[PDB]
Amino acid sequence: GLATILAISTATPPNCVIQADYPDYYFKITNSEHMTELKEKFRRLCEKSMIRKRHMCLTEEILKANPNMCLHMGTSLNARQDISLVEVPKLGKEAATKAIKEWGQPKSKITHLIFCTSAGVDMPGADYQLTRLLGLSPEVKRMMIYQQGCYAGATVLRLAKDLTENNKGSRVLIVCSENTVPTFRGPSDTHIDSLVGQALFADGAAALIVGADPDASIERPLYHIVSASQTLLPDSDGAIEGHIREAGLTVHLKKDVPAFFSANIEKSLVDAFTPIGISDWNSIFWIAHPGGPAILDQVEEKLGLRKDKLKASRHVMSEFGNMSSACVLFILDEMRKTCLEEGKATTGEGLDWGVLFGFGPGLTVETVVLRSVPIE
Amino acid sequence: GLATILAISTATPPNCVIQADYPDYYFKITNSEHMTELKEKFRRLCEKSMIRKRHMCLTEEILKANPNMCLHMGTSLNARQDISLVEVPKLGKEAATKAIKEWGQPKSKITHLIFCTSAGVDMPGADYQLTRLLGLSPEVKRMMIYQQGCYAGATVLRLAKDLTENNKGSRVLIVCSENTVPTFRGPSDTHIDSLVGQALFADGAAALIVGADPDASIERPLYHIVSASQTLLPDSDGAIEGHIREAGLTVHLKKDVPAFFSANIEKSLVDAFTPIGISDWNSIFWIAHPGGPAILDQVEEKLGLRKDKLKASRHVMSEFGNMSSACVLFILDEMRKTCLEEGKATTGEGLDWGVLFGFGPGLTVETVVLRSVPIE
Numbered sequence: 193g194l195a196t197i198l199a200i201s202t203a204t205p206p207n208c209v210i211q212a213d214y215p216d217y218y219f220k221i222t223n224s225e226h227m228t229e230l231k232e233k234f235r236r237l238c239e240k241s242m243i244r245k246r247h248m249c250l251t252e253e254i255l256k257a258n259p260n261m262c263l264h265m266g267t268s269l270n271a272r273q274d275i276s277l278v279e280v281p282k283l284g285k286e287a288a289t290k291a292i293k294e295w296g297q298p299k300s301k302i303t304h305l306i307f308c309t310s311a312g313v314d315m316p317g318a319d320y321q322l323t324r325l326l327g328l329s330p331e332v333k334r335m336m337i338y339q340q341g342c343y344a345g346a347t348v349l350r351l352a353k354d355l356t357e358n359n360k361g362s363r364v365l366i367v368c369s370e371n372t373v374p375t376f377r378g379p380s381d382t383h384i385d386s387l388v389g390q391a392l393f394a395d396g397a398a399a400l401i402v403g404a405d406p407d408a409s410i411e412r413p414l415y416h417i418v419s420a421s422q423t424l425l426p427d428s429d430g431a432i433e434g435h436i437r438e439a440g441l442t443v444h445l446k447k448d449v450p451a452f453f454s455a456n457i458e459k460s461l462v463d464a465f466t467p468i469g470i471s472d473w474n475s476i477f478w479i480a481h482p483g484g485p486a487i488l489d490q491v492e493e494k495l496g497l498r499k500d501k502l503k504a505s506r507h508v509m510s511e512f513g514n515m516s517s518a519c520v521l522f523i524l525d526e527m528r529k530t531c532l533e534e535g536k537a538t539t540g541e542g543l544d545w546g547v548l549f550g551f552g553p554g555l556t557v558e559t560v561v562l563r564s565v566p567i568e
Numbered sequence: 569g570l571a572t573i574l575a576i577s578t579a580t581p582p583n584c585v586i587q588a589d590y591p592d593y594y595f596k597i598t599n600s601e602h603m604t605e606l607k608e609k610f611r612r613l614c615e616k617s618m619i620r621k622r623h624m625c626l627t628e629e630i631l632k633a634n635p636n637m638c639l640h641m642g643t644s645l646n647a648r649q650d651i652s653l654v655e656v657p658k659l660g661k662e663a664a665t666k667a668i669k670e671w672g673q674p675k676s677k678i679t680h681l682i683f684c685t686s687a688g689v690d691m692p693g694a695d696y697q698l699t700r701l702l703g704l705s706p707e708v709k710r711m712m713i714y715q716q717g718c719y720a721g722a723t724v725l726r727l728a729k730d731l732t733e734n735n736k737g738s739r740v741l742i743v744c745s746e747n748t749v750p751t752f753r754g755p756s757d758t759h760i761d762s763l764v765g766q767a768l769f770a771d772g773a774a775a776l777i778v779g780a781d782p783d784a785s786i787e788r789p790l791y792h793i794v795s796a797s798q799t800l801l802p803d804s805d806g807a808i809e810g811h812i813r814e815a816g817l818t819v820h821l822k823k824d825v826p827a828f829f830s831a832n833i834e835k836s837l838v839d840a841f842t843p844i845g846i847s848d849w850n851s852i853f854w855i856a857h858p859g860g861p862a863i864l865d866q867v868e869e870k871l872g873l874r875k876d877k878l879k880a881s882r883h884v885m886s887e888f889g890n891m892s893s894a895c896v897l898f899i900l901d902e903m904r905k906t907c908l909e910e911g912k913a914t915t916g917e918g919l920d921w922g923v924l925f926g927f928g929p930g931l932t933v934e935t936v937v938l939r940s941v942p943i944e
């Protein structure tokens with residue numbers, strides 16, 4: 193009777209940028225090539241990011257039409273909203289349609305909708321827009337999770353667990369849709385942490401169907417959501433902040449963000465897995481939000497993870513970059529697809545128990561304990 | 569085993585405005601006294617609003633320091649954010665402290681926090697700020713409900729029901745905190761619907777403790793949350809919209825908003841109460857979001873409600889105005905207090921079953937079915 197993931201799909205905007213080409217493109221389109229040292233610093237950030245490509249619905253053409261978006265602090269929120277508020281549900285609809293097709297049931301059986309984005313707020317919200325675009329029932333029970341940043345891919349699983357398990361027959365559609373329209377901006381030699389965001393953030397959407405008590409004749413379980421926790425890390429106030437301003441969403445990142453997450457992550461593992469009798473962190477499958485490669489590297493080092501535990505998470509980071517809440521859902525899709533292709537015994541890389549982590553502002557750690565499903 | 573409201577408290581900023589004096593004050597502080605006809609129109613709106621007073625943390629002094637807030641469309645989002653993002657959790661903390669005192673248990677027993685506001689978004693959110701201000705456990709499970717407008721006082725009860733009932737031992741703190749900092753603006757003879765907002769919107773916060781399985785030795789039930797639904801009204805797209813812009817939160821209201829809600833409300837009553845065997849809408853106690861007096865008047869007329877059914881809802885509207893999500897929680901507090909004072913048989917005006925309605929963008933109707941508790 194646990195909430196069960198029944199289908200997962202993803203979508204990205206067509207427009208792609210090769211990370212190796214990005215420092216030249218970025219410093220040219222923002223008219224900052226005279227910033228020779230800052231460009232080389234950005235080059236190092238992009239090289240160290242461990243990202244091969246990123247999708248961005250923002251094109252050279254759109255940026256030329258909105259030049260204040262290319263300044264560091266140009267007045268541009270209205271322009272960003274005009275673009276993003278249409279894009280967020282549109283990209284989410286692409287992912288949702290594919291998830292519903294995989295699931296194979298009529299959309300009239302979707303009783304709940306969770307929509308999640310940090311790319312722009314509006315009233316009514318992206319949940320309303322998606323409900324109308326998909327033609328969901330007017331009576332769909334909606335939860336709109338706005339502006340919760342990079343841990344929210346786990347938040348929506350924590351939410352979906354309680355919705356589906358407390359409501360017999362319920363089926364929840366989850367949609368996360370994120371993009372760089374509010375955060376893209378030109379460079380500043382007094383805002384290096386803003387450059388880090390320019391090296392990492394990307395567009396993407398993911399959609400899931402979740403329900404308790406699957407009908408084995410028509411539905412196929414992929415993961416079970418066993419537990420979901422959330423905690424704030426000690427002494428971490430101010431380490432990640434994002435402010436919605438006249439210049440868009442400004443991003444503020446302290447250098448010891450990776451150290452906070454790696455220094456505290458084992459406590460979440462202990463609290464989540466000791467009650468189950470589990471203590472070997474290499475004996476569980478891992479989905480870790482790739483907020484940056486340094487978070488994943490330092491967690492790996494601190495815990496002594498074998499070097500392939502984080503392969504699925506690093507693969508999504510490499511092929512898609514930091515798509516905020518969407519990343520962990522992309523990673524679940526990657527792992528179950530790869531396990532089916534490679535003939536593994538379970539959707540969790542042949543292991544039975546797994547952990548999914550969201551990392552973001554607070555500092556907040558979201559810890560979800562999963563069970564895999566056998567692949568017969 | 570139903571989610572049960574165990575404590576309710578409210579808070580308002582000290583600064584109060586008498587509605588009879590507001591047209592003169594408003595047209596003076598916005599430098600618009602030459603708008604003689606528009607001022608009289610605003611006078612009629614304030615007279616017809618059925619509001620006696622409103623609380624607003626915004627003072628003449630603060631508005632003088634932020635003159636772009638007094639224009640109709642002056643660039644002012646940064647100024648509004650600077651004020652509102654501090655005020656929202658501060659006013660919420662005042663209500664939360666009082667609710668926790670009423671409840672009487674240690675704040676370490678609060679396992680979940682729902683924070684709700686449409687007065688300003690930030691990362692981390694007001695839930696984070698409140699957790700630190702109150703000293704809740706770092707492991708409190710937080711849900712941040714941003715920008716869902718006037719139906720969200722019911723949304724948080726719908727959310728709290730599933731959180732508490734799916735988690736044994738859980739106790740949820742709900743805080744709604746709303747204010748006029750993002751919406752206050754000067755008048756425009758081409759934006760009459762914006763004037764309607766200036767006549768109606770107000771500041772306030774409410775806080776509740778909710779939990780299933782109350783401990784009768786230490787806790788006192790006030791209401792049980794039996795069911796919670798949400799629906800979009802047919803052909804209503806665009807009737808209420810709110811946009812987060814460089815000039816703040818702009819408000820857009822069609823004239824037939826009251827007709828949409830009154831024409832469709834009985835369907836929600838039918839769906840919610842027919843399965844319980846209830847059809848007499850005068851036989852249940854009522855909590856109705858006072859989005860404007862015309863909504864309450866037209867619902868009353870359409871359904872044939874006796875003229876005192878909406879007394880508690882109209883009382884809160886009169887003494888506090890439209891505080892968005894906080895209103896329905898103020899009304900629950902008023903009704904249980906009044907019923908205790910007047911010696912009624914139940915916290916629901918002596919009736920056993922009750923309905924609580926949230927109204928807002930979509931158009932969305934939130935329908936919560938309540939049970940009262942006997943007063944011995």
Ligand SMILES: CC(C)(COP(=O)(O)OP(=O)(O)OC[C@H]1O[C@@H](n2cnc3c(N)ncnc32)[C@H](O)[C@@H]1OP(=O)(O)O)[C@@H](O)C(=O)NCCC(=O)NCCS
Pocket residue numbers: 233236237240241342384385388432445446447448449450483484485486487
């Ligand atoms: C950004 C990142 C990929 C850079 O990788 P790295 O080069 O191996 O790490 P380094 O310490 O060598 O950083 C290289 C340079 O960027 C600077 N830098 C990195 N993070 C920075 C930050 N948050 N603020 C300011 N400068 C920063 C470093 O100081 C260094 O500058 P310098 O060589 O001129 O002295 C890596 O630091 C990372 O993944 N950080 C976590 C990112 C994060 O916070 N994600 C959450 C976003 S919501």
Ligand SMILES: CC(C)(COP(=O)(O)OP(=O)(O)OC[C@H]1O[C@@H](n2cnc3c(N)ncnc32)[C@H](O)[C@@H]1OP(=O)(O)O)[C@@H](O)C(=O)NCCC(=O)NCCS
Pocket residue numbers: 609612613616617718760761764808821822823824825826859860861862863
């Ligand atoms: C605003 C309100 C109190 C006015 O009460 P009322 O005077 O009895 O109703 P009226 O139709 O006579 O309105 C008076 C005037 O305001 C105008 N008006 C009212 N609502 C308006 C709107 N949404 N847009 C533009 N004008 C509006 C009317 O046209 C009328 O102007 P006029 O006399 O010069 O022709 C009442 O209409 C109400 O409660 N409306 C619902 C408010 C609402 O939408 N709340 C949700 C906010 S999120």
